[PDB]
Design a protein around this ligand. Structure first.
Ligand SMILES: OC[C@H]1O[C@@H](O)[C@H](O)[C@@H](O[C@@H]2O[C@H]3CO[C@@H]([C@@H]2O)[C@@H]3O[C@@H]2O[C@H](CO)[C@H](O)[C@H](O[C@@H]3O[C@H]4CO[C@@H]([C@@H]3O)[C@@H]4O)[C@H]2O)[C@H]1O
Ligand code: CA
Ligand code: CA
Length: 750
């Protein structure tokens, strides 16, 4: 309990705690130890405001440099009907920040801690700036000691702050659908207990489950797995919810023009899809209906001469490739690259074991302790355990059939993004198709290109690649009426919302480059010459003194120029031209090979939707797609949709919990499985209420691997099914409740 910062026992709201869209007071409540105590009650006006919370800002930064192995603790409980996800941001005197987050249930108050130093922060990650994981290759670790306190979950930022000056501690609730209220008490620093040197050892049992924790629903033997199977199989009969048309549209509603394909139409002031037969349609369903992302790095590697190399022409990025069948020749050369990874697994099969076919090999990774290596899919292994093999790979066919039966039973109207192409002829439930434009075209920088530099969309090779991407999608979907539409790409790093530098990173970086060999720079220069005509008019506009356009075309540093209204207008126009060109080229390619199908945009995240780029999508995309990892769609955040007046779709959302073995709930956190389901209905209700949305897909079908998906270490409870391929009943029930009213509520009387 070493160092108490705030116990509120002096009955005052400290004046160095600042509050935003929240009321604070001191109240008596029953604390952890059973005794009455003074605590801070914080009532956030989070239904009305998309940012609320407190910020502790001491007059001088705290000097905690003596605490070389210590954590910051809070006692927290939610009050009322709703759990609370708090974002903890701690900022030091050099501006460096980390973010952690956790759910705060209603009910019994607990202690929560955020490491400041020591243990699994000591060697924090791989040293790569884009690696958000801990050194283990997990996005957030199990705790480094045993206790009743709850560890705030790692999200992103700097692992090792300058403890000689901590400048701000922030707790916030963001984009909520409801007012949230908490009591906070006993804000303190405690030295860390000794590190448990086994904390990363023996994490995973043979089913891929958390080995050390026995939770409700955990599988303890093959027989229990088969029992869960048989119970589910007896209930799945292939029957869609009542009053669905053939393509999952609404039978009981207006019947509109039938074109033979999914299309868009505004119905009584609300955007809808319309299915090939003319019935109103609203898209619900799950992303990642595939096994590509279900494998986890085992810590072994192969002799490179034994591994097939990637073709330069492949349209599929490594993260979305099928699980790679590992040969005997490769497996013979198996050696240990990460002792830390390898010691995580209580069981991996020998080359000759019947489950050894669920090995995978990844030739790259976005982040983690390994750049490449062997991986294993426990989920895939469990499909073999559940369904057996009556000819090679038969459990996969059975998986796909059970998957479509599930979606129909659960009331979903579609298979979501990243559905394996083997579902494309299921001819029982519609699906969404996808492609990625990748290749060797030139690139530009935005300043935040965490997944690779942005495409130079004016390079003719970009268009050659987009056409190849669309050709392959068209080949896959076979012009099917079951295909709702095509997503291309995902969350491209167009710009970030922080600042002018962040928003206009593409214009700014690009203007800095010479025109020669840079097609986007050439297009920007061409646009500025058309607007201004003369170098003197440009000089006047930007406050510069270039001698000529030729000097301008050697590259101009605009980083230190203050952003006048004139300068912002040129940056805005440049970003618009760039986004217009991206969308023109992708739209054109999709239209060329798939003239009948909806083009669904590029899936803008919350952090990557500058208005220039949205307006460009709205011009070319039939439906504008957004990813939104929030508790819902707040009113003010989405009010801009009315001006665009385009049908829109949520590509991705989720809510996770940690009561089913996971070390990380995911991006948005619930107090339990039940609370996950409640939060799902809250999110979906906001989608259903918004007249611009024609659907929302949940990311993803299955939990990520406990020890992290191979690509980048995400280890989240974000599935409708767990690693044993067993449904979370609470999500199933929430989905049924939601899917039963999508049509009646949206289209009905009020
Ligand atoms: O430090 C960067 C961070 O900045 C913070 O401000 C952001 O809020 C963080 O946002 C996140 O950015 C990424 C990673 O998590 C999601 C969150 O918005 C964004 O990604 C998508 O969401 C899920 C999360 O479970 C996956 O990461 C998903 O990744 C895809 O999965 C499959 C299909 O396509 C690829 C792709 O990686 C893979 O094969 C993302 O769509 C953060 O930006
Ligand atoms: Ca107290
Ligand atoms: Ca993966």
């Amino acid at each position: 309990g070493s160092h108490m910062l705030f116990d509120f026992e002096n009955d005052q709201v400290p004046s160095n705690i600042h509050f935003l869209n929240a009321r604070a007071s001191i109240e008596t409540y029953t604390g952890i130890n059973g005794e009455p105590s003074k605590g801070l009650k914080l009532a956030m006006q989070s239904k009305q405001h998309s940012y609320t919370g407190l910020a502790i800002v001491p007059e001088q930064p705290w000097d905690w440099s003596e605490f070389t192995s210590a954590s910051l603790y809070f006692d927290i409980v939610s009050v009322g009907d709703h759990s609370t996800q708090f974002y903890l941001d701690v900022t030091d005197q050099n501006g460096a920040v980390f973010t952690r987050s956790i759910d705060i249930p209603v009910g019994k108050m607990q202690s929560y801690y955020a490491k400041l130093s020591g243990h699994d922060l000591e060697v924090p990650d791989s040293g790569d700036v884009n690696d958000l994981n801990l050194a283990s290759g997990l996005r957030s670790n199990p705790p480094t000691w045993t206790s009743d306190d709850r560890q705030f979950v790692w999200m992103w930022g700097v692992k090792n702050l300058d403890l000689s000056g901590i400048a701000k501690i922030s707790l916030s609730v963001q984009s909520a659908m409801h007012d949230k209220t908490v009591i906070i008490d006993n804000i303190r620093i405690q030295p860390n207990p000794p590190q448990d040197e086994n904390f990363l050892v023996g994490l995973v049992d043979e089913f891929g489950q958390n080995a050390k924790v026995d939770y409700k629903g955990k599988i303890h033997s093959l027989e229990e797995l088969h029992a869960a199977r048989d119970v589910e199989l007896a209930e799945l009969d292939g029957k869609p919810m009542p009053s669905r048309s053939k393509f999952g549209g609404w039978l009981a509603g207006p019947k509109l023009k039938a074109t033979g394909y999914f299309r868009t139409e505004k119905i009584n002031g609300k955007w809808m899809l319309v299915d090939p037969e003319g019935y109103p349609y609203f898209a619900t369903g799950l992303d990642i209906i595939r096994l590509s992302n279900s494998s986890t790095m085992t810590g072994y590697d192969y002799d490179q001469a034994t591994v097939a190399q990637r073709s330069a022409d492949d349209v599929t990025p490594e993260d979305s490739k099928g699980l790679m069948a590992v040969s005997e020749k490769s497996f013979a050369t198996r050696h240990l690259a990460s002792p830390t990874r390898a010691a995580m697994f209580n069981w991996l099969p020998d080359y000759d074991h019947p489950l050894a076919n669920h090995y995978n090999y990844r030739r790259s990774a976005h982040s983690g302790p390994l750049k490449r290596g062997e991986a294993y899919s426990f989920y895939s292994a469990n499909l073999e355990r559940k369904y057996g093999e009556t000819y090679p790979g038969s459990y996969l066919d059975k998986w796909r059939e059970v998957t479509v039966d599930r979606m129909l039973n659960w009331g979903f109207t579609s298979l979501g993004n990243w559905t394996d192409p083997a579902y494309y002829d299921n001819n029982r439930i519609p699906f969404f198709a996808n492609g990625w434009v990748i290749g060797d075209f030139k690139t530009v920088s935005s300043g935040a290109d965490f997944w690779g530099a942005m495409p130079d969309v004016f390079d003719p090779e970009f268009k050659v690649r987009a056409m190849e991407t669309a050709r392959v999608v068209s080949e896959e979907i076979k012009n099917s009426p079951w295909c709702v539409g095509v997503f291309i790409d995902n969350q491209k790093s167009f710009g970030r919302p922080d600042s002018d530098k962040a928003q206009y990173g593409i214009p700014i970086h690009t203007l800095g480059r010479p025109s020669e060999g840079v097609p986007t720079r050439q297009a920007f220069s061409k646009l500025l010459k058309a607007k201004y005509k003369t170098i003197a008019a440009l000089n006047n506009a930007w406050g510069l003194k270039l001698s000529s356009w030729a000097e301008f075309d050697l590259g101009v540093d605009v980083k230190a120029l203050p952003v006048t209204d004139t300068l912002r207008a040129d940056y805005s126009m440049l970003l618009s031209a760039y986004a217009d060109q991206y969308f023109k080229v992708v739209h054109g390619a999709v239209e060329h090979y798939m003239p009948n199908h909806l083009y669904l945009g590029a899936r803008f995240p919350d952090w990557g939707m500058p208005m220039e780029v949205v307006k460009a999508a709205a011009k070319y995309a039939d439906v504008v797609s957004y990813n939104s990892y929030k508790e819902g769609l707040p009113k003010q955040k989405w009010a801009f949709l009315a001006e665009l007046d385009k049908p829109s779709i949520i590509g991705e959302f989720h809510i996770g919990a940690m009561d089913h073995g996971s070390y990380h709930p995911g991006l948005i956190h619930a107090a339990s499985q039940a609370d996950r389901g409640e939060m799902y209905k809250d999110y979906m209700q906001s989608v259903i209420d918004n007249p611009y949305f024609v659907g929302a897909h949940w990311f993803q079908y299955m939990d990520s691997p406990l020890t992290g998906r191979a690509y980048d270490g995400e280890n989240y409870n974000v599935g409708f099914v767990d690693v044993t391929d067993t449904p979370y009943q609470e999500m199933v029930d929430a989905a049924k409740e939601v899917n039963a009213k999508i049509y009646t509520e949206r289209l009905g009387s009020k």
